[PDB]
Amino acid sequence: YVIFEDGTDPYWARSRVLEYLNQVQGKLPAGVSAELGPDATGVGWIYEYALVDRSGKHDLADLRSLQDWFLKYELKTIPDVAEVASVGGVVKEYQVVIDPQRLAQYGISLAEVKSALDASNQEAGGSSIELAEAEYMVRASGYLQTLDDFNHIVLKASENGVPVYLRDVAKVQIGPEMRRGIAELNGEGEVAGGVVILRSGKNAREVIAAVKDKLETLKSSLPEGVEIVTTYDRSQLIDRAIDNLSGKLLEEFIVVAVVCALFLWHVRSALVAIISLPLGLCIAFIVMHFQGLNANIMSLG
Amino acid sequence: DVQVIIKTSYPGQAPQIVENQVTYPLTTTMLSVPGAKTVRGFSQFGDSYVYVIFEDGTDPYWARSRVLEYLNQVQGKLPAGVSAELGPDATGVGWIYEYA
Amino acid sequence: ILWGTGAGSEVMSRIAAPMIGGMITAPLLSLFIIPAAYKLMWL
Amino acid sequence: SVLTVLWPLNKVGGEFLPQINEGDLLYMPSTLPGISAAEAASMLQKTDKLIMSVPEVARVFGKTGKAETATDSAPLEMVETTIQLKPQEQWRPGMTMDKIIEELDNTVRLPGLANLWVPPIRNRIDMLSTGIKSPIGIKVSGTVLADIDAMAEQIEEVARTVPGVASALAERLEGGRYINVEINREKAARYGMTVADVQLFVTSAVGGAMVGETVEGIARYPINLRYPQSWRDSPQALRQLPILTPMKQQITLADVADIKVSTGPSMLKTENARPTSWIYIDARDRDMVSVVHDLQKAIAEKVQLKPGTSVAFSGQFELLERANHKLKLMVPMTLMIIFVLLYLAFRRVGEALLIISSVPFALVGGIWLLWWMGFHLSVATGTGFIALAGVAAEFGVVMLMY
Amino acid sequence: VTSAVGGAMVGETVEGIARYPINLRYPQSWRDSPQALRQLPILTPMKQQI
Amino acid sequence: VIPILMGYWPLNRFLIRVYHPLLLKVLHWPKTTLLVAAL
């Protein structure tokens, strides 16, 4: 984590940290790559939601999948979102469990199996052959998609006969990958959810509104029995706190008005003092617009 | 407008892949770039063109150092050998002089 | 800039036409409408 | 008098901006996808031979596909030839650029190719604004590929039934032909051979993947690696395609892979991460705004919308709307500033409100001269108006002042 | 140690936009305890069982 | 603006007395008031 001294351009600091990051990629280990963080921080955790299911029907590894690969790219779009982030759930994982009795039985080494794996999940194209009058694009299938396709990973094959498949040396089962984060709702249900992270220096409230909006658009798209229970809404405080200061301003106006009113016993002059306030705000708020200041307990204060 | 192009070749790969694996992971990750208006992008025979248009009055060079940071965040995601390469310092309007 | 038409005079005409014509109906009418509705105004 | 403004108003048309004339125009034709490179060249030659046939063209630099630049993505058969023009002065004063254009239109023909004539500085600006090469263009969005293809196909049809339109085409996403090599994994295992090294005979042999590059100083030329043309002539030719197994077995490709023709995506356009399909409309005699209205209605009635599929008019009109809005509420502004600055001189709303009244007569006068000159209501005229008010109010201030 | 004992992902299934990991591991039984690892079976490049 | 707006458009006596019996008592001898102050 790289913290910068007061008043430095959030984006200069990045193009800054980027140049240096370049100077260091050579040093550090082989395959590793230092990746830049998001356009935000921990304070940017504005809105959150849990992805519950009312039917037991929907898989908890299916729920995150629905989030990581749909809800994410629908919310990411949103105006000032630095990133929507999945939390909890379970990642689907094609876990091949090797059987040693089956590896000695066929004298097949691991490095072999692993290499047999890497080479059985691709596509490729050999340009275009002109059949008929038109040019034909040429795709060639190859992706692992069926659990069956994993089972027939050719390991060892004998001329004039049976080939040894991965299935002949391991059980291939769709399984839960090791978690690094567990999300949970009340005591009622372990759930998958996401958080909406605000780009540094933007308006949380407005982003939240746009989030709510986009979420009402996307409810018609989720499976039956999935409700989006919202876990953290930052806009609540915004409201509670913004009204509080608006209350005082009015409270004070009336108070000072009535006080000036009492002393003067003359309404007109009691109000002449009064009218100093409405214009007070107007001038105050015009300056705010220009410097780039907004309403908030502190400035309203 | 201030536009920045990200070209990416995914040698010999169907459009429906280029989109899934390159043009789309790229178009979606680019709409969230500060000051981005629209993001036109389309996949091809084995190429990926992504165009990032910025809202009125943004620094042509900020938009680039901007599109550069994010481009970094995405190189890890997208396919093995592929590399998203930044476009030139111009656009289609910059086609000034030509010769045969 | 309304009449002459070389390179780019296409756009300058479209903004010269309204001004020219419009600068007849206003000055012309003003001559008659401004004394009229004015006498009728004071009294 | 202010009432007489209604007859000229109904005769004038509406464009975004006028037609600024540059002594070059590029001929771009919305052309369909299944073709070869040679067939593209011959077209490029023939076309330019006729582009060059027209009396007033000077040079013609044809082009297909892209120039070595990320700026240009144009695939082959996407013709984009730059036409150069001898000074219009030299032609006998018996026609416009529109006749020039019109001759080109009748001269080039060739269906499969809907030919569009545009001006170079304008086309590239239009393009990095909306995306549509033509001034008029409809833009259908959606999430289901085939659906927004239907809409496009329907609107393509319905669009050309409008008067002003000459050539209205709609590109079909799902319309591109493949040769499918469904590699049977089992059939592979038998011959001790992997989906990977089956594809090598597809990638290099069938195709022509560059296995590397000759280096000659600064220079750098590719190194191909391919089977002769003979085994890569047709689908059947590929079913035959010979293969040497790692166990030194001699087998055809149809042995370890069934190969079937099919269709699918030609090019996948996603504007704002949502699939889009477009339609280029071409009308050059009618009025710009008008056409969109006839189209707009010809679509609302005779073509109902699918779910998750929205249509929207794009290009020059779309840019005209963003203007109009901002442009229109400019009068409340202008007026307030004109009224207010007058309210200053005489301190009485009376003579200020009357003198302000001078303009509604200006508008009439100008809007009439607009008719006389067959000029169109453009973001140009709107600027001539906002300027007019200033001096129109000036004349109203002197008669009043004196 | 990496794959058998651990569960190193030897690659990734690709399903359109989606992308799920591919594990490669020994069953839980040989990776239960230190002792379980002392037992851990290995097939030598010379086809030895150790 | 306020002068233009002001131009365009009991308890107190008791108030005054209250402060004006302690006022003269303070001048009685200032020092002590300041001693009180410091205190």
Curated annotation (Swiss-Prot), chain B:
It comes from the Bacteria. Induction: Transcriptionally regulated by CusR in response to copper and silver ions. It is found in: Cell inner membrane. The cus system plays an important role in copper tolerance under anaerobic growth and, under extreme copper stress, in aerobic growth. The cus efflux system is composed of CusA, CusB, CusC and CusF. Belongs to the resistance-nodulation-cell division (RND) (TC 2.A.6) family. Part of a cation efflux system that mediates resistance to copper and silver. This is Cation efflux system protein CusA. It comes from Escherichia coli (strain K12).
Swiss-Prot record, chain C:
The chain crosses the membrane at residues 15-35. Part of a cation efflux system that mediates resistance to copper and silver. Belongs to the resistance-nodulation-cell division (RND) (TC 2.A.6) family. Induction: Transcriptionally regulated by CusR in response to copper and silver ions. It is found in: Cell inner membrane. The chain holds residues 998 to 1040 of 1047 of the full protein. The cus efflux system is composed of CusA, CusB, CusC and CusF. The cus system plays an important role in copper tolerance under anaerobic growth and, under extreme copper stress, in aerobic growth. This is Cation efflux system protein CusA.
